[PDB]
Symmetry: D6
Subunit: 170 residues, 12 copies
């Protein structure tokens, strides 16, 4: 009952809301921003840039559930970095699995990428568990990689390959 | 069917065109630029409004219901050839419209645009469509191997064509 | 028939212009650029607003119904010539307005634009049009072979002219 | 009871109306135009160009009476060409004298021009009489100067100088 | 009078400014470009919005009635000087406002802009204004001969000035 | 006081920003360009929307009244420093919001922007402001002589700083 | 021994020389020009415009013999207007036939045009004879079509079709 | 004297043009923009390279000495008129070239540009110039009062014309 | 042959490329824009310098003699396919270079660009070339009917392809 | 002296103009923009090449030695006034040239430009120059108080003028 | 080895940069745009001259031979990290310069750029490179699976890091 | 015997050389740069920007001795920050006093600034002594203000006022 669709300009307020409660700077095409005004101008400036692709997941009643973002897309190595955010009022209702599958499905069956990877805070073992359930595997434990809430934190880098995803039931 | 009209695409038709996409498990293109959002489609529309490499038409019935899209792409004016595609919206498939749509497109291509050759691709795994095109005078000239990545695998397609001299005679 | 007035084309008349084309089996042109959509037409209009190689006028009745279009194209200010065409909306064909529009267009061309020669094309397989133009003082100067691809085949056209000296001495 | 004020964009429809019933091409900064659309674009394009200055004369109830135009303004020789047009519904109500004085007043007491000249058709002796009454004097009888209604016409060039205007009662 | 406020000119004030002109028999200027129409004024406004050679303020009363205009032009930031003019709208002349307006302008010039010298021109044929400026501490430093063409003849003007050290002490 | 929230400045807050200036006897600046009018401000805003040398935030209460402004300027990403200022609207002065805004601004600067040093200027002839900042952990590092021309005379200002290491170990 | 090649910028002096001794205005993409400077700027401005194509014919020793120009190229009706000029020192050496065949060959076997037409002065029966020998046929006798050396002259319009050219020996 | 040739002005002739001005006590103009320096002239040249309201030609002898300049300005393609001026370099005055240049300029104007009327200005206090023009078929149509400020005073000028019909029937 | 090197096209190579054209009786294209002159080619080169739809390489020997041109066009990075062409200059045809050139192109396409499929067109009336491509692992997937207007008639071409998995295994 | 010629400034003269500056203890301006370097001067020159608010001329002798600069600034074409300055290069001061230079400038201003009034500023602390201008028909119309910051203090200047009717009669 | 100097990259070093790539079986990038030709590289250089996300330096010897390249990319000024790579020209490999270049690059990164973390990628199937970096204080934090398509297959890479705190306390 | 002159583009190599041996990032109008190419582009971009002014001091033989830079120039508060650098081969030859006086002279007698201030490393007592001798006084001891050679360093801010400089001998 959830559907994935391309981000549109009318979704920017939702996006901006989602970044509001985060203890790290937000980027659009690697340019940092804080305001809705910046975001809108960056959106317009990068509208044809294929290095990042974003999608929103909506329910049957068109409530926005979450954001799926693919950034650092490289079309020789056929890799991209993935992040998802679910709106606070929809957390813990088991939608994160659905969003991850929809993003993997799109990445691997339409965009024809070879590898998707993500970062997750070491101090977030619940999210680690989710990504592992969905076929991600740790390939890195990056040390003091991001300054987050007043201190350099460690993150896990985790990946999945297209060949795994598409053939693992065959 | 005699009631179906073909007209040029206009900017107020892009919502329809964009909806025709979200059902397809292949990337969509406008003048060979990929796009996913309506916003992207609109900017691409504006950017290529004078470009004669591609031409698009929509078909409406009598009540101005949008029936489908006719698209000519890769238009070359020395060799006088174009690649043709048609999409019919969901709620109007299975109504015996396809033939009329194909006929209006061929008519325009050959009676107004003065093209020599029109070709199309159809999935090998789509035999009913092959049959249909065959009835409208298309003939296979190629079986393209692993040509397009569609829904998670590289798929073969038939390339079918028809010529102006055949259609007009 | 003296209730018909000729005015310069304006951007709000482009819908009417575009409608007049849908009834013709020949590619339409604006300043020699082909177009099919209203959107195209409107941008071409904007692009050529100051270009004096073509001039257009619409004819209206006392009640402001749009009757037809007069176009002067390939205007050359050394040789003082131009190609002329009229198009009457379907719903007003056969009402006896064509002779009036022709006279208005000639009057403008010869008394205000100070042109020396006006010519037109007419289909050879359109003899009653040939007859109308003769009655209005045009004379055949060419029979152009396979000149235009129209409705699936190359068609022959008569070129017909009239001069300023003849018109102004009627 | 008549007042002279600078032309504004909202007056362009009036201007365009005034040119409608004229048997000569109209110019804005020496560019010919027929449509309202052209006029508006030319207006915007030349908004800072000091080679021409235009003014509208309005009554007490803000009805537009006429147009005063100064063109070919040259600030070394301090000369300009003047034309006035009165709207057909206000002709023959003795406003032409008032418009001419207002334009001369502005030309000579604010713009500090040295010479104003105008052209008038030889075949318009009524207008010749008006300008003579207002202190203009013939300096030229220009032969076949303009093509007007199907034939080259003669015009009088007539002038007045600032020193005449400002000191003739002293 | 203590109720009169000075604020920066804004785009919605240009109608007022333009009206203040049509009564004057001299050409009006914006950043030394002459203008006659409102349309010209608006484009000039937009074109020079960042230019610090000239600064303008309007004075309003308590009910936001527009009282007049204060204009500093020829602003030079090495020599720290500017030429000052004030115009009071018709329906508010003869109300004992001029002094307050001049005082607000001098205050701004000397307490915020940190100018050293402010000068103005007044027509010789306008003695009552000379007297007024004199009361506000201005002194004649020149009698400019045939300086401006105004209403059909070249007219003389007085140039009057006041310094920051005098005003602030 | 925990009902106050800090958000990024947006174009719809510029009226409030502009209002805050009319109460100050010092020239105002936006990215080091001086401005006096709202029109100026709005163009400067647009011009500098992507410039990361200055960042601004507005504080609102639970009922969305605009309480004040936090500005970080001269931001340098090598030396990791910035100059900080707050301004509280007149109608909310003295209500005990200043300490809260300061803490929010410091928290942002030190936990999200990862700055090393924040400094400010305060008037020497403003001792109770000096006292507020001391209470919030700032220490004097300069007494700048005749630094700014304010209200008719050059005034002295204290420069006061705080470091990231001190703040994060409170 | 003659070869046809695309016009290049270094050939412009030759082109300009060729127009020098002609009693009609010269055009580049329907813009008139007299100077070498104009020509060069027009060349650069229209470098990607497919409405006209020009070629120079050179001998074995790279002497420029003549110019072949195709203008008014239309890619729906697949027609173009052709002109050739031979440099005065190479006239009457039987090169005109060769240039005409090379242009027809290119038009019909590479550009895939359907129709080529040209104008020739009625008062130039020698050139009429040449074009007739090379398969052109009169389709029009255009009356007072061009002002040439102080008077309106008549011209023959003459054409050849691709199907004639390609199949006439079959 | 038939060794003199008329060619279009080119950018390498601007030094000569500029030199011709230093000998005149009147402001010089290029497309109605006044100029004093060579630098100005060169930019004005570039700016107006495609503008057809003025055309210029230089006359050279068989040995390529620059003899003089022919200028056609205020060219109007409806009324088919232009203002003509010649200037002969000081060192070639009195040699009998002026009549030849005049004839060349008239021939061009009337046989290639297809103009209807050419006019010129000559100083009233320059009677031998008046005499030259009369001999070349010009006739006075105006005596313009205080038309141009020249060398410290406003001077009167004769306007003198010739028509195409008269010239071509000589 | 082991001495032949493939490098990226550069602007000083456009003279060579242009010369390779004047012998061919088909229109030449750069990013699907037709061109005839060197001047046009140079402006097209500059205009598309960042466009990744087409990639070109020249092959030189040891003495930096230009041997030929390798061109990948219609490059699509979702389907991972490109159309390939090679031209060998006159004075170097018939020297047993073609195979090496084709091998360097396939190598680059499949080992660096990570394309999945490479296809080419060859004239049906050119059997010796078909044979050659066949030896390098290409296989016919289409016989395109009256596809291109070449030297005065519409000609048929074979479409041949090879896949990355085949080449690399 | 009869040998001295006035011509319009050209771009190759900017080196001379820039050298005339480095001796003066006041900021230099071009169209009221301050400048210090040659590079700045050259860009300002190019930017204002069409601006008729200021006009400049250089005077050369017979051997094309540059003698000095004549500058008209603040040119107003309604009031027909301009501010005039002249600088004579070091190695040519004290040669009885100044008068001729002033005469050529006045001649141009009044016989060609058709200005009504020319004015200049001279330092009060420069009496010999005042005398000179007086001999050329200039008269004091103002004593401007603390007008310019020059070499570390605000200095007074005389404003002197001459009219067209006087010069030409 | 202390005769080696590190300087900023300049446009005259791009030939050397380009030469270093021809020896690598991986697509090259400039500010994440892939390039193959020198022409491309030179335009990308120009385009990104002010972009601070990447910085490059070339190492030369006392005789000015170009030894190698140090590149810092993905530079982030909040988290204070960057990815580092060196490349030594073929002819200078094995000479013992790599350790020196590494130390120079680290010194710059940590003492002038004030970065917190430097990381690099090295091929897993390049163990002696792994050994060099370990000796220079780098430690493995990831083994990235099938990260880059190199020479016909997806290869694994080690990610290796070093911190500012460790380096500056050596 | 030393002279101060405005910086010119031909001096940029000298400037770049001077920054070479410095353990802090270099800025031009607050934009950081390392390469000569960046510097040149920044120079051109800011050529009319009055926020910074630079001067070079040359001897009698035109050897460049040093750079004087005024940055953060503010024309309301009439203050600027000053730095000087002397080329290594000219250090310790007593030129620093001369450069400081020339800069103060220019600042105070031509630019009409009110205040000049500078920063000097606390760990550079020799330079502190020099500036004190030349009338500068400490107004601040800024704590951990700049990251310089691997650690946050303290600097003295020191100032002098125009009124002191100009009147202290009176
Ligand atoms: Na994108
Ligand atoms: Na199109
Ligand atoms: Na037009
Ligand atoms: Na105007
Ligand atoms: Na301003
Ligand atoms: Na910012
Ligand atoms: Na072309
Ligand atoms: Na022209
Ligand atoms: Na490319
Ligand atoms: Na000027
Ligand atoms: Na960079
Ligand atoms: Na500067």
């Amino acid at each position: 009952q959830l559907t994935l669709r391309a981000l549109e300009r009318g979704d920017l307020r939702f996006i901006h809301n989602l970044n509001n409660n985060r203890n790290i700077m937000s980027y659009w095409f690697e340019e940092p921003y804080e305001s809705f005004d910046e975001l809108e101008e960056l959106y317009n400036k990068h509208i044809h840039d294929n290095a990042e692709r974003r999608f929103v997941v909506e329910d049957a009643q068109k409530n926005l559930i979450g954001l799926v973002e693919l950034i650092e897309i490289n079309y020789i190595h056929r890799s991209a970095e993935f992040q998802i955010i679910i709106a606070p009022e929809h957390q813990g209702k088991g939608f994160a699995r659905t969003l991850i599958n929809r993003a993997l499905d799109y990445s691997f069956t339409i965009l024809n990428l070879h590898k998707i990877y993500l970062h997750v805070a070491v101090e977030n073992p619940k999210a680690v568990h989710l990504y592992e359930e969905c076929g991600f595997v740790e390939e890195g434990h990056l040390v003091e990689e991001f300054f987050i809430n007043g201190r350099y934190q460690d993150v896990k880098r985790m990946y999945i390959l297209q060949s795994k995803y598409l053939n693992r039931s065959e």
